[PDB]
């Protein structure tokens, strides 16, 4: 079965599945966990950075796409660089040409369409990385979840990566609570760290291990690492 229908993205299995796409989705699960959640004034990204050795650094997992947009990655880092770079250009284009900031919902559509092209043609490969996009635009705070399949969804919160299910249930529970953390970033961030620690197991989030990013009403997308996140551990 599968073995005969998973040699490339251009082949459908007898049940209508696309194994290469599914194998790509697998790379995400093997990726370190990252969380995203938003109130009505802010959007936050909390990501667990993973290290190779104890002599190595903890790979950055958050990328800023513009002053009002950014994302967190889970999976093949190179593919996030490509996709975020494309998102950076799209935001730049909107500004230069229309003097308009790119809608978070529009960015989602653009990512979906770029990912889709890599799942219908011979020769390419699907992207092997998941992305959580947060941003504040003309309609408020936003959070998006991007899957290599090309599926992008808008949510109040979510998590992707290994053991992500922990944080996801926590948020699906804490919903009514954090969705109202308006005008208080610190509270939103803490709620983010509390959701992410719901997916821990190995260790505990440390200073050079935790990575947080926030954006909102009067807050340009900014990234906090190390000492700067100490007050949240």
């Amino acid at each position: 079965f599968r073995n005969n229908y998973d040699g490339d993205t251009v082949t459908f299995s007898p049940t209508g599945r696309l194994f290469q796409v599914e194998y790509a989705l697998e790379a995400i699960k093997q990726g370190s966990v990252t969380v995203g959640l938003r109130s009505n004034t802010h959007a936050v990204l909390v990501a667990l950075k993973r290290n190779a050795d104890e002599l190595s650094s903890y790979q950055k997992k958050i990328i800023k796409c513009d002053e009002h947009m950014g994302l967190s990655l889970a999976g093949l880092a190179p593919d996030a660089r490509v996709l975020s770079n494309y998102l950076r250009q799209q935001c730049n284009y909107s500004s230069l040409v229309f003097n308009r900031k790119l809608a978070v919902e529009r960015a989602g559509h653009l990512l979906c369409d770029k990912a889709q092209k890599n799942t219908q043609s011979y020769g390419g490969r699907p992207y092997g990385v998941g992305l959580l996009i947060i941003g504040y635009d003309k309609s408020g705070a936003h959070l998006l979840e991007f899957q290599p399949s090309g599926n992008v969804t808008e949510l109040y919160g979510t998590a992707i990566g290994a053991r992500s299910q922990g944080a996801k249930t926590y948020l699906e529970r804490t919903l009514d609570t954090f969705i109202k953390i308006d005008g208080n970033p610190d509270e939103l961030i803490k709620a983010g760290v509390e959701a992410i620690s719901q997916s821990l197991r190995d260790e505990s989030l440390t200073v050079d291990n935790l990575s947080i990013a926030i954006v909102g009403k009067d807050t340009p997308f900014t990234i906090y690492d190390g000492e700067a996140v100490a007050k949240y551990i």
Binding site: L96, V97, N99, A103, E105, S139
Partner: protein
């Protein structure tokens, strides 16, 4: 590089306390032949923007088609197309400006002079000019071609500097502009007596007046004038 054929003359405009006014006659000249009389050179875009165009008419019609498409395109996958994500006057302008400059840089311009008038979502007045060279500028009053020499001096007697805007009412403004149209009919050999006028008020919205006419002209003193110096009868 080209040469205009069918052309539209002046486009005059100014801003008042609650919005902006813009006008243009209905003529499409062909050299010295006043060939076409039912030409509308004022292009409304949505209900907060009016684009006035002078210059080559064939290119104007092309700018028209571009503007219709912008509206269509903006609607695509945009649940807020008639709300928070509708086209702002500044978006319309930046787009056109971009095109005008690209076209001159390719040595194949859109032979026009454009004035984009409108009200931004936050109530601000918007008045900016762009032409075949891609040159752009803003001023409390703006006019193209002939109206730059004759209309601006009049309109500027009402709104000489920024601080005069809040002191200028729609009545005073529309009056200034209607008088300017008469003066242009007096001294511009490529003008028509019929014209269109449009108001974009942050409270009353967009008011588009068609089929106006220069009225209350002074010609009686013409009878007292005979010869060109010494002739008595």
């Amino acid at each position: 590089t080209q040469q205009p054929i069918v052309t539209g003359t002046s486009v005059i405009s100014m801003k008042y306390d609650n919005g902006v006014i813009i006008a243009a006659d209905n003529l499409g000249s062909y050299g010295s032949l006043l060939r076409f009389n039912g030409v509308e050179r004022l292009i409304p875009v949505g209900d907060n923007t009016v684009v006035g165009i002078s210059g080559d008419i064939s290119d104007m019609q092309h700018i028209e088609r571009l503007l219709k498409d912008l509206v269509t395109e903006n609607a695509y996958d945009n649940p807020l197309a008639d709300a928070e994500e509708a086209l702002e006057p500044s978006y319309i302008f930046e787009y056109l400006a971009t095109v005008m400059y690209q076209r001159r840089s390719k040595m194949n311009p859109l032979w026009n002079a454009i004035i984009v008038a409108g009200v931004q979502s936050n109530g601000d007045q918007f008045l900016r000019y762009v032409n075949l060279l891609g040159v752009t500028y803003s001023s409390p009053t703006l006019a193209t071609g002939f109206g730059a020499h004759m209309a601006n001096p009049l309109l500027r007697k009402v709104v000489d500097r920024e601080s005069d805007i809040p002191k200028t009412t729609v009545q005073v403004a529309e009056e200034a502009i209607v008088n300017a149209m008469r003066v242009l009919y007096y001294r511009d050999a490529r003008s028509s007596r019929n014209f269109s006028l449009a108001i974009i008020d942050k409270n009353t919205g967009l008011t588009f007046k068609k089929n106006l006419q220069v009225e209350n002209m002074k010609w009686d003193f013409a009878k007292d004038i005979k010869g060109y110096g010494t002739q008595k009868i």
